[PDB]
Structures are given as structure tokens and as C-alpha cells.
């Protein structure tokens, strides 16, 4: 975002009132990793070619659940309706992206700074934009860098976002845990990647490219060593993420 | 208090790191009312008088510990201990507070300000300071307003409390929770008191005592009509607890 709206003050009421509500039943339902799926999926359909998709509400659209990527995302969509329907003033947009900050939070990640003020947009992006988990480095500069404008640092931070979370076979074709501790976000995702694969935890075939990279190896390094760098460069990637097409960019 | 001790930005840093690991500790293991019980349990026991007890840490001593009414927090200082190791430069009293407040955010609740600064002491405050459920207004007010210094709204705010957690028959003699659900942090508490007692939900005698005060009651509508009242008041309440005796008042 460069230039962010003015919302009313009975919006950035809601604002305060739904993140709050949010926390609660987020921590209580263990269900941080799907939401914060939830979010980036919302997010990461934005393509800077065309200027379309991105944070926009359109993914609680049939037409967009119907994507194969979004296996699984349905019961995300079910679980916070209840929450949604008290706050009536709050678009889908900012509501989904209120979510994926609160699930980075309550699972202990770094607090990323949010701003209300997206609009919830009638028709769902074309389907193909998301991530191939059997894909590698080409693939990711291309989905993350081309499409939607982000760095190579923030490729490596974002997939740190897998060390919360699991992949289910039915949803996916994959399955595991990335971690040892899927509901506390640490730096541990990395240190995983770097000690080799292992029977009990997951390591995709996008995940392993990082290791490969003259790029993103010496960071998925750095990120594996100090945890409060990692912290902040993935505070900056998810904002940014989180904004794609809003406020200007 | 009134005047905040001034602590090195390196003690700023391992508080905000704290409160992220307390966070994602707190939610997944789901011991927030536990933890509050802890926090509570440790400033509740100061006499603004001989300038005696409160938040600074004596909790964590066996001969504190042993104190009837502390019975099960042996269990939540235990639960904790592996954090604090990671934090050396934290007091215990800043710890336990810091984790009190983070109870009360993740369950739904107000955000509680805290500021460091409290020093550990070395000896504990004499047993029977804390409040008996058995007992009703004129004790209540015996204990917080003569011994700690809190007001009337205080009690009733602080109160409420009782919106998150359970009792347990091996720790009180009392059993069951007092909402229909415990991990949110609402104003139920007062709403279940104003339309009497239920079979499942618990209301002790401290409770009921405050339908029976001509200054309690009008707060208990006050808080039962509206949320937002009950958070503020309370948030105010729980920073005047968490300070007891500390920068001053
Ligand atoms: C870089 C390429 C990425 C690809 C190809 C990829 C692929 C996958 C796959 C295959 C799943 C589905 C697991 C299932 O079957 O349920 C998964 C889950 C997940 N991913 Fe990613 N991912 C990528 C990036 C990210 C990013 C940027 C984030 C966000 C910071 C993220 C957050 C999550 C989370 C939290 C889960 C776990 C959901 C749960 O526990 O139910 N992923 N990812
Ligand atoms: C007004 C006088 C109060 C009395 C006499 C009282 C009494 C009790 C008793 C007997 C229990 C049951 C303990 C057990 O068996 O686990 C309990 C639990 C609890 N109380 Fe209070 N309470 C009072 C004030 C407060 C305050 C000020 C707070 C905090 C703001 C609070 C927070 C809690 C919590 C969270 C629990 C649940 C503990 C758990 O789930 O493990 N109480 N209280
Ligand atoms: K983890
Ligand atoms: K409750």
C-alpha cells in the first residue's frame, strides 16, 4: 500500500472488535494454519500483468473454491461465517486478511500491521496463478516475482509460513507436518529443510528448491540461525502480501 | 503506579519477544484461565498499608506455594518455567504479570497495557491475604479496598474475570466452570449472574454477593448491558492489579 483510505470510525471500531473476536475463537478452534492458508490464498491470486485478483473477498466464491488449490478451504470459509455475520461493515477483503495477521499472532509469530480499507470485488481470478508444490525456483520467481512483484527475500520468508501446519492427503496429495511444533510459529521450518528429509515431517518438492538457490540458500541459512530476522523479514513479506493491489500498488 | 522505572532496551526486547512466546505457549496448550488465576493470585496478596505482598514474584517460592489457596498454581509456574529460562534478564514478577495480560488477549479479551520494571523480592507475604468465596461484600471490600486500594468498580470489573476458566474440586473444594464458554473472555459472567443458577455452571457465594451490594448490583447491569463498558473498566482493573505497590501507588 502507498496511499491507505480513510475509513469511518465505526469501521476501524469493527476493525478493533473483530480482531479481538478473532483471537479468541482462533485460539480456541487450533485452527491458525488454515487461516492463514485461507489468507495468503486470498492474497496470492493477485497478477501484476493484468492487475486482477489479489485480497479482494473473492474466494468464499464457489467458482474460486472450486480451484484445485483450494481443497479444504470450504471449512475454513464455514468456520468464521458465525464471526463474520457481527460485523456486517467489514468487507470479506479485510476480514479474511484480519484473520491471517491474527494466526500469525496467537501461534506466536511477529505482529504484522494491518490497514482496512480493501472492497470486496464481484468476480473470482482465473484459476492457475498459485504456487505448484512440485515446482521449483523457476516456477517461484515467476509466481511470487513476476506476478505478483515480490522479492526473492520474500519467497524464502513467506515459505517459512509452513512451520505452522500440515499437509492432508485428501486435500493436497500430500501429507505431514513441517514441524516438530505445527502451532507455534518459529524458525524451525528452516533447520528441518537443512538437516535433510525425515520419515515423520513433511518437505515438498517447492521447499527443497530453496536449498538449491544461490539465492534463497544463504537466506533459509540466516533465517535457521536467528529467528528475530526471520521474524521481521516475514513481517515485511506478509504485509506486503497481504496489500498486493491495494492502496495504490 | 504512577512513575515507570526506566530498563534497558535490551529488557524492552526480551519482553516483546516474551509476549510472543508466551502467546503461542498459552493457546495451544489452552491453560489461559490457569494462567490468569497465576497473575492474579500474584499481586492480590498486597498490603498498601505495610507495603507488604504483591507482583513481584515470590510465587514461584515453595513456602507461597504452599498456601492453601494457591493450590494448583504449583502446576501453571511449572508450565511456564521452560520460557522464562529463555528470558534470564526478566524478573519473575514482570514475567507473571506479562503472562496475565496475554491470558486475557488471546482468550477474546481487552488489551491490558503493561510496562516493566518490578523487581523480584526475596521473601513471600504472610498466607491469608487472598479472598474467600465462602464470604461475601464486607470481606470483598476488606480485601480490595483496604488492603490493596482498589475501588468499588474494581471489584465488580475484576470480577468478571470469572468469564474465562473452572473450578476444580481437588484445588477449591468448588467445581465447574462459571460461562458456557470458558476460553472466551466476554460478559457472560454477568449475564449468568443476573439470571440465576443453572445446572452445569457455577456461582460462588463471592459471586452471588455482588447481586446483593446496593453499590454492586448497578455495576453488574452496567457490565451485563455492555460489553464495551465491561472491557474498559476491567482492562483499568487489571493494569491497577498488575502495578500494586509498583512505581509508586
Ligand atoms: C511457496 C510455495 C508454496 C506452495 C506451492 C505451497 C504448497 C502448500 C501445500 C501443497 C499445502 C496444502 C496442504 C494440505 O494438503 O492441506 C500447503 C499448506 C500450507 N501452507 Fe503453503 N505453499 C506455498 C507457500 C505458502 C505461503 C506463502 C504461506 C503463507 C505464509 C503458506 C502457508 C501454508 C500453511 C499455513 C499451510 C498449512 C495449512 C493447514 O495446516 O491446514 N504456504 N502449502
Ligand atoms: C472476588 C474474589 C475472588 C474469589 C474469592 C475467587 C475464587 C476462586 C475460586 C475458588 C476458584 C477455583 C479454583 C480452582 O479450583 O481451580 C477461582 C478460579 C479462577 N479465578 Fe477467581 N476468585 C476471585 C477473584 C478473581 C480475580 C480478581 C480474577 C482475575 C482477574 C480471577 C480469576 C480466576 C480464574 C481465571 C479462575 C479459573 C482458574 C482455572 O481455570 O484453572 N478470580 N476463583
Ligand atoms: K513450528
Ligand atoms: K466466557
Known amino acids: 500500500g502507498k496511499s491507505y483510505p480513510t475509513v469511518s470510525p465505526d469501521y476501524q471500531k469493527a476493525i478493533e472488535k473483530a ?5 479468541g475463537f482462533i485460539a480456541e478452534k487450533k485452527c491458525a494454519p488454515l487461516i492463514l492458508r485461507l489468507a495468503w490464498h486470498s492474497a496470492g491470486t ?3 500483468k493484468t492487475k486482477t485478483g489479489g485480497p479482494f473477498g473473492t474466494i468464499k466464491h464457489q467458482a474460486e473454491l472450486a480451484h484445485g488449490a483450494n481443497n479444504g478451504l470450504d471449512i475454513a470459509v464455514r468456520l468464521l461465517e458465525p464471526i463474520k455475520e457481527q460485523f456486517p461493515i467489514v468487507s470479506y477483503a479485510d476480514f479474511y486478511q484480519l484473520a491471517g495477521v491474527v494466526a500469525v499472532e496467537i501461534t506466536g509469530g511477529p505482529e504484522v500491521p494491518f490497514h482496512p ?3 470486496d470485488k464481484p468476480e473470482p481470478p482465473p484459476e492457475g496463478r498459485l504456487p505448484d508444490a512440485t515446482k521449483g525456483s523457476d516456477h517461484l520467481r515467476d509466481v511470487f516475482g513476476k506476478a505478483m512483484g515480490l522479492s526473492d527475500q520474500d519467497i524464502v520468508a513467506l515459505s517459512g509460513g509452513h512451520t505452522i501446519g500440515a499437509a492432508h492427503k485428501e486435500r493436497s496429495g500430500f ?4 514441524t516438530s511444533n505445527p502451532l507455534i510459529f518459529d524458525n524451525s521450518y528452516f533447520t528441518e529443510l537443512l538437516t535433510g528429509e525425515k520419515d515423520g515431517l513433511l518437505q515438498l518438492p517447492s521447499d527443497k528448491a530453496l536449498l538449491t538457490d544461490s539465492v534463497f540458500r544463504p537466506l533459509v541459512e540466516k533465517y535457521a540461525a536467528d529467528e528475530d530476522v526471520f521474524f521481521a523479514d516475514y513481517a515485511e513479506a506478509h504485509l506486503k502480501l497481504s496489500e498486493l493491489g491495494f492502496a495504490e500498488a
Open 19 to 23: 480482531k479481538r473476536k478473532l483471537r
Open 46 to 48: 493477485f497478477d501484476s
Open 117 to 119: 480499507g480493501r472492497e
Open 175 to 178: 501429507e505431514g507436518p513441517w
